[PDB]
Amino acid sequence: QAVAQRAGTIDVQRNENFGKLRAGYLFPEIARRRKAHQEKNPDAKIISLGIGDTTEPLPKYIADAMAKAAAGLATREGYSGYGAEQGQGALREAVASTFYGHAGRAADEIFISDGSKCDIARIQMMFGSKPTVAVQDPSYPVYVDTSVMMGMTGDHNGTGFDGIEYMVCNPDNHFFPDLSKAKRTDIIFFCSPNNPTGAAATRAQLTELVNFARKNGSILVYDAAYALYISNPDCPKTIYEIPGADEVAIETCSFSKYAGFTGVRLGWTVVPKALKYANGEPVHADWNRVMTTCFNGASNIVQAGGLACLQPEGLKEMNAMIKFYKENAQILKTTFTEMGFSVYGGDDAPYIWVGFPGKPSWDVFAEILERCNIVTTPGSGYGPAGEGFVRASAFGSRENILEAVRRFKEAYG
Amino acid sequence: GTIDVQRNENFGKLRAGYLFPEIARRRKAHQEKNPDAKIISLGIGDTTEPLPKYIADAMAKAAAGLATREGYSGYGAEQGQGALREAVASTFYGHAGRAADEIFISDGSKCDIARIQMMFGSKPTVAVQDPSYPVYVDTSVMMGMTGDHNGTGFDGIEYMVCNPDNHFFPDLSKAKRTDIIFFCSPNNPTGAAATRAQLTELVNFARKNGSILVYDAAYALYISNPDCPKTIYEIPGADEVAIETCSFSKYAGFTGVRLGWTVVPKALKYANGEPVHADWNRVMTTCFNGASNIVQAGGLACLQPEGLKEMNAMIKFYKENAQILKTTFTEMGFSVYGGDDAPYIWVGFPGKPSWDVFAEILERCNIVTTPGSGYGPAGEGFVRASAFGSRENILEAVRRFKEAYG
């Protein structure tokens, strides 16, 4: 019949929350802008210091663990077990003892997933639309964008979204917000080291943050994805090194490509049993319900790679890879500082954060791409307080980092 | 206490934990009471047979190769590798109109259903086939799309009841209109594969009502009957109303694999014209980090000629297991459904609660099954038995069932 030759029919309205979003997500838009630039300039040899997708080859001890788990699928049955789609016990024990020995977290509070971004979306589903949110500003834009999608916010106001408390971190406050003036919210999202500024909060700063959350009765979602890169002994690698954090904080961590590991999609969350909603219900029970209902369990291939990373040879190879990326960050930082720019980060994180005052950061991004054929990311893509800066990733080969430096000195030196 | 955030009200609407973890817990408790019992699971379906080696090979080579390549960078795409999207579009939708840019590769269908529910939000009304795998009801409840539980099901859900007397297809002339309709074919747990005429009626009903149809084709690889479409897009006009979810994960029979896809046609538009594909792409790029390239290499190998030959042999094996189970029960006088187009059977145990039949089978036969009431209100009165297991264990389960019930 004619019906099948015709459009249309559908009476469901678009979710109002998606209409609030202003632009597509930052990293896909940067990849699209890079592709458009290569279409305009087919001969350009583009170096990406943008999204961070050009991670170096994975440590062989980890790759080999994953390969052997994959090949082993041909000679075993499917696994069966109550303990658990929460993640293999051996991996959750290795994560608990490697990262949370001093910090007191148990294996049964660790939940292994396929990535931190996926877990942030699932946390937001767990919170639902009612809670109010505060976000460190600038920050990786998953926190704001998932808050908007879940309906936790008002409309965009031309600078940020109404209803989000942006906790501004900048050079003048040493990248830590003024909590004596910060508004109370239900949820606080905080990252250390922060992406994009590279700032790793000090022990005294995190003690302030935990005491702020506790006084306000807020849940703190703490992103420690880049904590492997912290060098300063005064900057904790987990929020659980702070007394009282177990009653307010959920931590998210990543061993994925985002954190520097080629080919990996793996993270975890920590939800302490001590963390309880206002009427006493444990957050851990609801998180477990989300993880068993909305998720299918991280693959046993990737969990084999995570467990290998935590064995002696895996830690040795991982540490060498972290040291290589940090040396790339220092090469980029020194290049910019010798040219007279103000540069932040690169000491505790594998990227740097460069001031370009007086021009919108999206225009700077376009100018660097035009003049140097280098992709960076614009600071305004990380929220209102990101305007005036650009981030450059250290995830790349040493030859590409060195060619980028040559190109930057030629254009800007 | 020191936290003032209230629990999400929608989590208080859930009455019990999720079905599959509870079956696993029951199995473990039974084993602890009976440490010498040799328990055969025909329950969750976790005991899938070893993965076809051509797939495992591709995954191992992709993993090993991580040690000698840089991270991938590319516009085409955080939706999944182009070669795999093209292979899915050609293999599964070559006569059904779908393009590679309508395919979104993920790490599994249950994660996609939760992300779909996020995209829809709390305002839409939901109809769910009943019985069905409980992710559709439970995610609807978590997202705030429903009222409270009422003793049988949740208020605010239109249950579309499929049973033996209606040939496992609801009476659409009497079904209330909703915004979203979740339907699966073959259905888990009944095994029913909707016919071409039935799916034409479903697509017509969705189009007349202006509803979005979310169609789960996870088990369509197991369909034998040529009258039963393997994708909703075989029905003219389905591109204007339907999203399809599919799985190549352990759920669909593939040991070790966490891989699925969704189809969101470019044609599918909300009431005021906005494309659903654009919001789904926003979700998949914001709320997800892209399926591993190890598992996508497995997916691509499964669709090459040797992969398909080995996958087809695996499907044929599980279907033989399902026929062995089905024959056993029918010879004992039970009414049995499924097994012909799905790798599980659905057996009538009228007059006793299915959770009591679950307990009885586990105590008398040391066999795990799943109770039909775990799949919604119209699942009561039945038990599902999975065909995902070794031939030795299937044969031993049949021996035990004959001793107990024959």
Author numbering:
A (entry chain B): 26 to 438
B (entry chain A): 33 to 438
What wording appears in the published article?
The DAP/lys pathway can be divided into three parts. three steps that bypassed by the reaction catalyzed by DapL. as a pyridoxal phosphate (PLP)-dependent transferase-like fold by SCOP. enzyme, the algal enzyme is specific for L,L-DAP.
Cr-DapL is a dimer in solution. demonstrating that the enzyme DapL is dimeric in solution. The predicted mass of the dimer is 97.66 kDa. two monomers in the asymmetric unit. V-shaped monomer and comprises residues from both monomers in the dimer. residues that are contributed from the opposing monomer in the dimer. Numbering is based on the Cr-DapL structure. substrate recognition, fills the space that would be taken by the PLP cofactor. active site does not easily fit the cyclic THDPA species. strain expressing the algal enzyme is able to grow on DAP-free media.
